Structures are given as C-alpha cells and as structure tokens.
Amino acid sequence: KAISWIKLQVPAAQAAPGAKIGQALGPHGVSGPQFVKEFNERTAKMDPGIVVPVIITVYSDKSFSFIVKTPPASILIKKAIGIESGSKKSNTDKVGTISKEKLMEIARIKMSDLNAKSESAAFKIIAGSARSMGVEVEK
Amino acid sequence: MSAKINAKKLEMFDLLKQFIDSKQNLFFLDYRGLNVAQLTELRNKIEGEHGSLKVVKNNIMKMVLKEKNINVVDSCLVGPTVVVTALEEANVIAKIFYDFVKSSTLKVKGGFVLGEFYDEAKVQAYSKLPTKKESISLFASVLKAPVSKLARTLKALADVKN
Amino acid sequence: ENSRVLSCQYRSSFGSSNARRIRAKSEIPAVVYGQGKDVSHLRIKSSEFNKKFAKFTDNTVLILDDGKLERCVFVKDAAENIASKLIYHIDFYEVDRNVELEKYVPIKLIGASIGVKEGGILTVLKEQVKVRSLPLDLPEFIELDLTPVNKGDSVLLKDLVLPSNVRLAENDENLEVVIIK
Amino acid sequence: MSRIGRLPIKIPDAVKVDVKDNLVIVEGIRGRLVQDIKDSINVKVENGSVIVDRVLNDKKAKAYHGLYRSLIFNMVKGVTEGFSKSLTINGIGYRVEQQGNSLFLSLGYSTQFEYVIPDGISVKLDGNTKISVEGIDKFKVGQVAAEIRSLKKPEPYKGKGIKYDNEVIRRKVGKSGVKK
RNA sequence: UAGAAGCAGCCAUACCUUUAAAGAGUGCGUAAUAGCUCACUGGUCGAGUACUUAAGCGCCGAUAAUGUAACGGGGCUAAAC
Q: Are the CB atoms for A82 and A96 separated by under 8 Å?
C-alpha cells in the first residue's frame, strides 16, 4: 500500500528539486531529486515548460512511484490556439477558436487520463474544457 | 407527484430487464467500502472481460427476477449489491471477483449461472474454475500425459540396453 | 375527457344577498349566453372548478352538463378577488360545437436556443398566432422549442408543430414569430 | 405517532418482565427496576415480548406511547447489560482518586473536592485521568456523569476540564492564532 | 490575485465522462491548498411524510410608580368559547 498520495503539476523539461519539489517529497519521505530526475526523463519527450500533472504514491518502505499524466488540457489548448492568459469572461469574451481536428487530436493524445470509452466523448470533454476556458467551439 | 416516479421506475425496470435478458450469467456483489477508484477499476476490468456491472435497485431487481423466473435467495439483494451480467466468461468474471475480494472488501454475495443459484461456495468454486479454452488445454495435457509417459519409458528402456 | 366536463344545477335566487349565501355554501354563480338562446342561470361547485381549471385562459373551452344537456362554452369571464382567492361569478359564452372558428392563441417558449447561447438577440415579434379548429380541439397554448434555432434565425409560422386538428389561419404565413439576431 | 412507539420489545431469556396495576417490574441478572405507566397506555407481555398501545388517540397518549416504550426498553437493556458512560479529565495538574464510595478531585481550585457516589452506581478508574460510571439505570448514570462534568465544565481554548468521551469540544484560539 | 486547488472576488456550471450518483460543490476551516461534511445515489427498516392555503380557538411580542388591581369578589378546566 501507499502511505502518502501526492498530486502536483510540474514543468516539463524543467524538473528540478527546488523548494516546491522538496516540500512535495519530504513530507512522504520521497527522494525529491530522484523524482525530479524521473520527471525530466519522462518529460524530455514532453513539451518544454508544459505543466504535466504528476501523481505520486509513496509507500511505507520509502519507495515512491510517480507518474506524469497528460498535461493540463487548458494549457494544451492555449498552446494550440496561441492562448497564454485565460480570458476572464469565458462566457462572452472569447479568447480564440478550438478547431475540430485539433480538438480530436488533443483528445486522442490525452485519452490516457480521460476515462471516456468513445472518441466522440473525449472530444466533447475537450470541447467542454475549451468552453470553460472561453475558447469558441470550432464548427 | 407519483406519475413521474412511476415513469422513472418503469424506465429503470425496462433497462434492467434488457440487461437481464441480454446476460446469460449473472451475479450480485456487495461492494460496501469499495472506493470510487476501486469501483472504477473493477468496472473497467469487467468491461474488458465483456461483462456489464451496475447498481440495480433491490426491490426492482427482485420484482423483475420474479417475473423472469429467477428464484434466488433474497439475501443476495440484501446489502448494497451491484448486479454484474457476464454472458461469455463466467470463470473470468468469478476470478475477477476473487481478485477484488483479495485486494478489497468486495464480496460475491450471490450468483446465477445457467439459472443455477450459486451460493458462496459454488460461486467461489466457479470463480476459481478456468475458461473453456483453458479447460481444453488442460484436458489435452491430461490426455497426452499417458502418451508422454509411455514414450519416455520406451526411450529409457531402449537406452538401458546401451 | 372528464377533466373537461363540469356539473351545474339551475338557480333562481337572483340577488346580492342570495349570491352571497350561495358562495357561502361554496358554489359559484354563473350565467351562459350565446347562440341567440335565452340566458341560462346556474351554479357551479367551487372545489370542482378550482381542481380542474386552476389555469384557465381566454382560450380555454369546456363542456357544461346540467344532467340533461351538454353545452360547449368558452370561459368568457370570471370575477376573481385576488386577496381571498375567491371566484364570485362566471360568464360562459356558448359556441356551436361543430362550427369552425378562429382564435388568437398564445405561444409558450421552451428550450435554450443555440443562437442566444452564442450571442443571439431574442425579439418576440408575435406573442400569439391565429389558429382554426372546432371548439373542443382548440389548443390552450402552442409550444415552440428554440434550441435548434441558431444565430440569425427567425421562426416561420409553418414551423410551429401544431396539435392534430388545429390549423394555421394567418393571412401572412411567412411572418416571423420570434427572431434571434 | 411513530414507529418507535410501536416497535416490539424483545425480552432476553435471563430477563423477566411483569406488569400489574399501572406498575412494571423488570428483574434481570444485574438488578431490578420499576416504572409507573399512565392509564392511557397499556403494556402487554406475550410470547416473550413486550408490546405497548393506547386506549385513546389524544396527543398526550401519542407521546406517552413512545415514552414508555423507550423507558421499558432501557429498563430491560439495563437489567441485562447495564449502562455505562465515561469521562476524561484533561488539564495540567488535574487528578482524580477513589477511596471507598467517594472520589477526590483535584481541579485547580484551592480546595480538593470530595464527591460522595450515590448508591446503585459504581465508578471505575483508568489511571488518574479517565472515569467510567456504570450502573443499572441509564437515568442515574447520566445524572452522575453530568454532575461530575458540572464540577468542572470544559473550556474551548485548551480543552481543559472534564469532558464526555463521546463529546466533541469546539475549539477557539487565543494569542497566536490572531497573528498577522 | 501572490495564492483562490469546490468554498477573497469576476464570469457560466449550453463542462464532459465512469455515470448507481457526485453540484465550476452545502457549510465548517486552512495565507494557498490540505482536512472535515452535504446536496447527490445505493442497502436496513417499514406509511404516510415535506412544503403550503383557508377558517375555529390558542402562544410569544405584553411593558411603572400607596396595595393583589386589565373577571366586581370568592372561585371556576367549565362555572370558558
């Protein structure tokens, strides 16, 4: 069993054992530098600077298993459509358009962390996230 | 204020009846304390195994089974019980249930395979039992065992004249 | 079909004091006129009227049975005291049960429209539509769902899905009932 | 009325119950308890069980239904299993000790409190900061535990005082919680 | 915004999925989470319950200075309506 469960967001290609990583790793007796090295090794194949979510389970035997899932969907959509800062009035002030093909590709890519059984359902989850961020749905 | 409840209950009964008529084999599991993640993983495993597991109202399920000629002990419906219909791999479903019972507190309260009300012991035996392909492989191995023994004995006897 | 039937019996009191006594006995004085007949003075059970026609409009039509005859009547008027929720007179306009007739009927808007969702402007050009039917089949109100109506879309009168024996009567069939710009 | 008033009363084998002339006697392994029952309610012992009903349907009788059902139930559970309510003494220098049929409490006051224990009730210690009152009557047990708690009611700044074990004390802050 | 991880604050929550059922979260409380709870739904139990409307009597609101002192008194659960 895992003694501690930690959920964090990390900068892909920039995983270092600074204050944040040390605070995350020290509470559960987990090697913060080892976790940072594993995160860098995993996120080398990820976009540099991308905030990849990380779920870490630290057992009683001091071992920690840390998995970096698909990065934030809001971050991925903002990168795709050139969105850096989320539009405040996401209901009216559209920040951009989320293309149908781009949404389908993003949903297929992030289907690992999405619990849907249909590609249409995954694309709908992506589109709902885009609407919540304020991105106008692509027709 | 009661027609709407009647309509919702009728729709639930119809969906449950469709599942019960589509499922060749059925089982009921008491999953009290089975966490959200554990339930999601168990449902994913059942879906991969082709079974459909879902929570069904005890009274509605009992009425539907009484209509459909399912004469099981009501103790199976006693307790929050997810009904899982498996039509192809009953051994696989039982093995998955046993694995969940090992890795969590879920219990296989009742079972119904070929209209046979399987109690705790019968359900455990069925779950430990393997599938049809594995059974064929085991029967083939058992049948070939005498042939392999005879061939080995003949080889040893022939060598013993060296 | 019962829920459109109403039991009455004749009254011969005809006074303010008499009407007050009737309403104390928990009934409603009422009169029926139309079709050139002599006016019929009758009384109605208040509990029955409340139970059945708690939502009556100008276009509601119903059946009066005095045990010996049937009448098809509109609720032409109803004198209501708002403070005490008290009906204290009913006017029933009779019509012929088999004569086609016209009547403006209001619309009821349902659903959330995609256009208004995305920045459309509701403009309810028409609050009612002239329809045509026999009295017993007149629609109380005609429904309209806006959900598929996207931006820059107007609603044609033919687009209104209508009850079975109800038919449009507008001279301008192509006028728009509600627009979303 | 409501289902507690009509819910039947099971009788343990070791426990005997008897009803007569507006009185009930319940004799068990650990003692004997008595109760008055009002005229409007009738109590019956049949088939090793106790049932209660009402001759009338006035609201006094409605309430009495449940009241006497519950009392007789607690009257039977006591004679079989006895009632016990426990307490904890928390705080610097607070102590409790026992001598015979009385308890001595050190609770910060300039006098050491003696406490006569009423008859029919026993007191059990666990070290010098844990108490448990046991007895035949739930009413008496609650009374004693309450009066002991009143000897030094708890406080919210540090949890000091005499608390019911099941109780949860809402807690405030003092100096350093207001830190800016 | 510095934080806002459901709970300073802006916007909707036409955000989807596994859906039994889970709200862009009901409250408590954390700089920020964290943490504890609820709507929500499942099992044990086994009929009325939950919100309102109109009337007949009632409750609190009710509160000055020589002495009970706002039934004439005694008293009255009718000897009240």
A: yes
